[PDB]
Amino acid sequence: APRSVDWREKGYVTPVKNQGQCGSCWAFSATGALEGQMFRKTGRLISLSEQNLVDCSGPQGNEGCNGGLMDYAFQYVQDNGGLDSEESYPYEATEESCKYNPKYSVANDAGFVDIPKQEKALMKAVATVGPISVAIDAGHESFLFYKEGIYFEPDCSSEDMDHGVLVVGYGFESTESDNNKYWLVKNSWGEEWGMGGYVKMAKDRRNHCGIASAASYPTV
Ligand SMILES: *[C@@H](O)[C@H](Cc1ccccc1)NC(=O)[C@@H](NC(=O)OCc1ccccc1)C(C)C
């Protein structure tokens, strides 16, 4: 596979968004992965509605601001036959009744692919598919205050993930410890967080923070 991948340079990725004070990371991860696959198919990058998923994907198993799963989000778009754009169905950071309107749907998918729980398998998917939805253990003060460099948290769990994010690539950079590989991760905490809203997470370091444990993408 390539040593370095950055799907932002290919036009697959919208600007960093902000979920606010709502447990809806899973919806931002899902829209990001679907935004990439819709671009792959149509050549048009359109921001998609997280509020659509928060409000409407309950029947697939999601719980709005109280958590959810990207796979469930991908299931909703398939079962629902569409997903509205972000401009038509903007984000309110609160759970409301479903207001989906198919006339403003800009995205569809025919299911989703679960990536084996191997960092090598995740690398193959990022190199060939596009941005991938992943779950990580982000429940550490070090993650809140991250600014730059490769993020490594010794107390991160590979099995207790609590935060959905989007792998848009991977790469390397020389470091003190010679642990130079990283996943390029788009967060949904606004661009003031981290590096323009992005973080470089340690790659090939015992599945750090569980990044390969719950990876998937929509089929478009
Ligand atoms: C990210 O904003 C969100 C925060 C949160 C963590 C734990 C519990 C609630 C909310 N993280 C997730 O949604 C989390 N999902 C998760 O733990 O899946 C289990 C689940 C919880 C609630 C409803 C349905 C499933 C990420 C995506 C792993």
- Domain residue limits, the chain: 5-219
β-bridge partners, 189: 18
Measured distance CA(158)–CA(150) in Å, rounded: 17
Q: What is the dihedral of CA 209, 193, 39, 117, to 10 degrees?
A: 0
Method of structure determination: X-ray
Ligand 1: which residue has its CA nearest to atom 22?
A: 67
Q: Which amino acid is at 66?
A: N
Measured distance CA(135)–CA(146) in Å, rounded: 18
Q: Is 119 annotated as a binding residue?
A: no
Q: Decide: 210 and 137 in contact? Cβ < 8 Å.
A: yes
* Atom number of ligand 1 nearest to Cα 69: 27
What is the CB neighbour count within 10 angstroms for residue 27? Answer: 33
* Atom number of ligand 1 nearest to Cα 67: 13
Q: Is 71 annotated as a binding residue?
A: yes
Ligand 1: which residue has its CA nearest to atom 1?
A: 25
What is the CB neighbour count within 10 angstroms for residue 18? Answer: 16
158 closest CA partner among 201, 126, 216, 113:
201
Q: Is 87 annotated as a binding residue?
A: no
Report CA 42 to chain centroid distance, whole Å. Answer: 20
Q: Which of 163, 186, 209 for a ligand 1 pocket mutation test, highest count of atoms within 8 Å of Cβ?
A: 163
Measured from CB, residues less than 6 Å from any atom of ligand 1 are 19, 23-26, 61-63, 66-69, 135, 161-164
Ligand 1: which residue has its CA nearest to atom 25?
A: 68
Task: Tell me the three-class secondary structure of the chain, residue by residue.
Answer: CCCCEEHHHHCCCCCCCECCCCECHHHHHHHHHHHHHHHHHHCCCCCECHHHHHHHCHHHCCCCCECCCHHHHHHHHHHHCCEEECCCCCCCCCCCCCCCCHHHEEECCCCEEECCCCHHHHHHHHHHCCCEEEEECCCCHHHHCCCCCEECCCCCCCCCCCEEEEEEEEEECCCCCCCCEEEEEECCECCCCCECCEEEEECCCCCHHHCCCCCEEECC
Ligand 1: which residue has its CA nearest to atom 14?
A: 162
User: Taking the domain 5-219, which CATH number applies?
Assistant: 3.90.70.10
Give me the active site residues, please.
25, 163, 187
Record the resolution, in angstroms.
Answer: 1.8
